[model samples]
Target chain A: RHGELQYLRQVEHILRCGFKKEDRTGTGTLSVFGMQARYSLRDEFPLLTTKRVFWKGVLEELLWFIKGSTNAKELSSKGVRIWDANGSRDFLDSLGFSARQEGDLGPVYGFQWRHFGAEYKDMDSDYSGQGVDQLQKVIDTIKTNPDDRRIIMCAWNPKDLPLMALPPCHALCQFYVVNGELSCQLYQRSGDMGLGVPFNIASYALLTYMIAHITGLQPGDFVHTLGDAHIYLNHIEPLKIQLQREPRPFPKLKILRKVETIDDFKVEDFQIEGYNPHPTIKMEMAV
Target chain B: RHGELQYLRQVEHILRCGFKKEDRTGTGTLSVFGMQARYSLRDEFPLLTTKRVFWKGVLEELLWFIKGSTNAKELSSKGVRIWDANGSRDFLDSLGFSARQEGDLGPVYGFQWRHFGAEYKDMDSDYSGQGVDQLQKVIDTIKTNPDDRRIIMCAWNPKDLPLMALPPCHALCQFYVVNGELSCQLYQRSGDMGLGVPFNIASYALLTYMIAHITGLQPGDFVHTLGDAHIYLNHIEPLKIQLQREPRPFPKLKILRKVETIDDFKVEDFQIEGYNPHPTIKMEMAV
Candidate 1:
């Protein structure tokens, strides 16, 4: 079986033996408290074959995060409107950010990634050379001291939580290096197993491939640990349909150019080849 | 088999299928990138019966974190010497904190837990209400917003690492509540699987017990997730012996008082009943 089988198995595990709980979205979930799944990046990209993952949206969103743009419209401008829900005018007003501009997401994932401790202003303010550039620090540490265990980049800033539209779901991530291969393990405090989990798997796996490419090491494993791995009650039927399909061979990810800098990546430089997948099963995202 | 069997199985897995890597302490290790184990707390404690985990050190050290003390002598006065290694004068000088007092551990776990994002001047400075009290915030969320997915308390401060004697190993943790029970999941960046893993498991388990007690809920599970789980070269022999021993039924933890406050727990208020463990397996501290 392809490594993507782990994702299916996790869904199966949660479906078979998950606890019932009400959530903030009023869409209750059947969730397990702790779960882990490992994906190998040795010779294949773990783009899910049972269902199609939105590759273009995943790439653009990651590139946006690398650019440290907290404004959701920055993503919206590129025809990647995945962040549009939370950036809507109604959502902003509902969170008591009546003074905030429509698309400014405040101190969310990208801000915490690039400028962790910097004081957050409106979306238009400059944040260059402020806070810790955790993404860059992680790259440098990988190049210099790959064995160092503190190669961590965090997004769950409790101080910044009040200022953001939504607190981070994929909260903290750590990178490890051994035998000239870099492995990444992400501890997401929460996950939406149907729609978001597929995207998250590809996102971080691609991130590891990118970091490994820059640091001149082979990409290793992407270990995903989740605190609350759940499926919304509404998404259960869709998942059952998706899980019935057999997993195909995972695709191969090819970086077209020898791009050196971490920030110098564009969507054109990467290609996902041999990704023949079953038809997409659509499910609503719980905001 | 007991739930603690997972710990032993993890050790066996690493020893059988781990990668050889050079560590910072010049000690080579056989390590696996990601692993997780869950312990049940449905009226039972997960204190290890295979090998004696230092129960007193685990309880006192946790109490010190609750008190928000960074001085090692405070723990030393209570006869807990776990912090003494990194707090010694020689270690301080080597880490370029020669100006700091011998016992002071600047801005470590306790400091980060209580006053995250506050400007830590020194160990002597008062930081009352200066930063986000994450501990209190977590408790409040558990009480009022138990359905919230963001009940996380973190100790990994990227900005505070340069000032700390040693960075946090158990970096971030999240608490989950369901059906009037609380579960805790910890994501540790690195762990000494032989010596520290057992203690780390019990430490966070006890922390979960404390929080569940305060919130008037039963303790559910302690989910321990490790990033780089390793057996130090020296630790392998001792671990092999310990792994061969049979696991006894876990003990039960009894809090002797009806203390409502989180900070009101003293050593005597907790009792570990029915603990019949094998003799301790001594291992050297990596620091």
Candidate 2:
């Protein structure tokens, strides 16, 4: 279906039946469900052709993922605040958590980066933690053992779910490296398609590329495994509107610079090409 | 580059110039890296042509990353010990860390997932541990705030560098989402092409897919921003051998089923098609 028509169908379906869940607290919920055609970076990147988006924001988000942070400070320094302005403020306030006195009241992305889904006890230590090394372990496994089926990571901690001003957003991830091929699968507990998914896809794929280069594996599939992958109960209408519209041509992603270490990356190192989407789709936050 | 040539070149490169940086403790003085490329699930999945690689071991490793567990017991059941054999065994023996009692004696993948580069005082409480929630946070941020630039997450923690049973592998990652286009860039501290890089690519690409799917965004470019992205100094000759050979046609990747949750995915869920490469390349570990 075209973008507008697809949106119409989805909105109509959600409005008519209402989304359902397998559990309360929205856990095991069935907010949205669908499959998509697969593509690759070798032939082309999967940039959307249905709408205009902030490419700069997307690049910044990728930098953030590699940095393994949860706050808006680093991104804010570059003029991005996709997390802080939305429900992040409320999420932190509810938990009685604030940014460090000297630093921004962060530990947002950093909290998740260092802690995964567990909780923090000490403000100083808890907020100041790290987790990128763990991600590397999985990559090593793939390189050494190409047939192991247990490569995975979890970011959702049950206790933190309700306590957070916002719940654990991207919940968990899994990876596979077969033969010399490398691929990944992610299970996001929740998503905001318009603003978040694009950055999320770009960020993880970049990670895959780096790992593959170092591990001697080939870039393969990027499977998006989602849990409550929703467009918000409110986002249905516009999605339907966009679905009805025709999707433009696919865009090309350009890595403008060369980097050697994960820490050496920045937002300015990326570019997009041939992006011809319809009008930009805008939406309101649930909070 | 063709598969045969690439593999040969990588192997030879690592064999010659690669000096062993044995950290005895998992953390080495420097880091190790990996990266790869894939055609698509629609094409044949890339497998090793040079040597006898344990395919099951590779799958298990991918699953381990998503689960974020370092316990060898589960992976041991499946015979995936990429880290356990080389680093875990030595580290555990040295630190007197035992899974039977001590609960992951030293720096394992799980430690990095939960503890990262710092010490974890409590493994039981909701006390937020150290791990990156980059996937989920990026999804949420993109949805709510597309203009925010500080959306990146990092995983390279220098503090815990000495504690890792194996040096921090696949060092760091970054994500970007713009105009609904999702892309990623990774900075690998080091890479071993003959064995590691290929699987690294596939695992991270899959991660990109999951994040993109949940957020209602399409997958974009995989920017492999590398730092010290080199073949092991010892494997130079083998890499030269492979470089002199031809890489077969790109393969197609296939996801056996549509998985919405990161927790619900399995290695059996994927299949690759149309991959053709020369014989497998072999090299010894620097350790």
Candidate 3:
């Protein structure tokens, strides 16, 4: 509970004392640099109940990343349209993409998660032969040598940055296993505090749970470390409203199926229990 | 002073509450899963005053990385023998490196920094033709587009891990510039609390300062985030000794000359003022 409040307090602090900075979206932000929050999954799942989170979208996006699909059409097909704005034809065309195929996000999260070293050409390019299967390799390592400290998965491909619709914000993640419990730490280079952070927190937490479940380990803590953690200028009122509400007990997440592989799990296999949030607070995404 | 003490307290916490976990070195450790510490470069240089830190070696190593030299001979040539043990002939030979050259740490920090996407052949293989220049690119971005969130340098190459003497612990780093002040956050996958954390802190702090200096920005903060942070069982007594000592005021770093490129820095160009530290606490390196 305190851990969740720490995150809310970070937003409050940034709103109170952050510097006004111009960003790529032209919507200015109140930004603070370098903040950390930790949530122990042993006690409760870290879904924030101060404001309602799109839990279905979080699970769908994570599963998409696990399946290593680059096209946002896969997500949209599953009724998760959160990435639609970024993958829209108009948006990609504005960024000078001539072949702005619908729902092609160009090797975003899922592509980088699995095919890390592959030379990504466009969303339609064939990269199946080239990259390393980092997610599979990490799962194998977790089952075999859990004590290895280098069990890390990084999504920030400098070569693919130019090809990406939006470069990864939650760029790097490292997994650590001790005494049959798995923990993960994510290094997010940029965080949109109001609109994006809640989703990011839940998304990575579910990822940690899924990986731990498949690897036959207990879930541990999820540490979210941010570099440029900011609240957009337009999100001040919504965030203040969020801060005013007292935090509820974090809900517990249940994986319904005993899946063999990480990719084998579906949205219906997971369920969130006791998540009674205050209300859904709406804010415009800076992008 | 609180920043320095916070590190000491972390050591104490690990000793008191951390789990006894086995590590690759076969030396047992009192380890915690995730931890973070922050130091403001605006207040003072975060050189540890609880115990003596090798400030000169830290600067030299950072310079070597900036110059993109992977050979330990480069460090040894500059009187920084920190990499000597890891790059020793016997050490390399033990790891099945038959053509073990003395200085070859095979595409370690510097190599990965400069050549991000390059195919890392062995130490003797010429890789000049391959890889993206991430360091140069990031520095260029710092100068031209300081607010860019993609300004990051990563050393954790999944392809190069097999050939490394030891994979990078300080795996990824991201820089943020706000209001003419440059702040840095390092995501270290593993941390040696007693021996290496102080050096890691000082090293990145100096890297931040040097980058800020060259980019015409003020030094801001250095946030250190860790996964699998541990105090080796052998390091406990020495760390306890460190805990007993009172911390002094942190020293201030001075860059004496104007440097154009990141590679143009020399050891003599930097100085530390008012560094009155306690006696050095000696401990065995787990490797």
Interface RMSD per candidate: 0.8, 14.0, 1.1
lDDT of 1 by residue, B1-287 (tens): 69979999999999999999889899889999999888999979999988999999999999999998898989998888989988999999998999899878889888999999999888878998889899989999999988778999999887788999888898989999988899999998898998888888889999999999899888998999999999999999999999989999999999998989898888899999999999999988887
lDDT of each: 0.91, 0.50, 0.87
TM-score of only chain B in every candidate structure:
0.98, 0.69, 0.96
So what's the TM-score on candidate 3?
0.97
Estimate, for each residue in B4-119, the C-alpha lDDT of model 2 and write its tens digit: 33434434544554334433223222222232332222223334444434456666776775566555555666766565554354555665444322224234444454444345
lDDT of 3: 0.87
Q: Say which prediction, candidate 1 or candidate 3, comes out ahead on TM-score.
A: 1
User: Model 1, which residues run further than 4 Å from truth?
Assistant: none
User: Candidate 3's residue-wise lDDT over B159-222, tens digit each?
Assistant: 6778899899988899998988999989889999988889999999998898899899999889
DockQ score of the complex predicted as candidate 3: 0.77
Distance from true position, residue B184, model 2, in Å?
A: 30
* DockQ, all models: 0.87, 0.03, 0.77
lDDT of 3 by residue, A221-255 (tens): 89898888999889998898888899989999998
Please name the candidate that would achieve the greatest lDDT relative to the true structure: 1
Top candidate when judged by TM-score against the true structure: 1
**Residue B236 CA displacement from its true place in model 3, Å:** 0.2
Prediction 1: B-chain TM-score: 0.98
How many collisions between residues are there in candidate 2? 233
TM-score of chain B of 3: 0.96
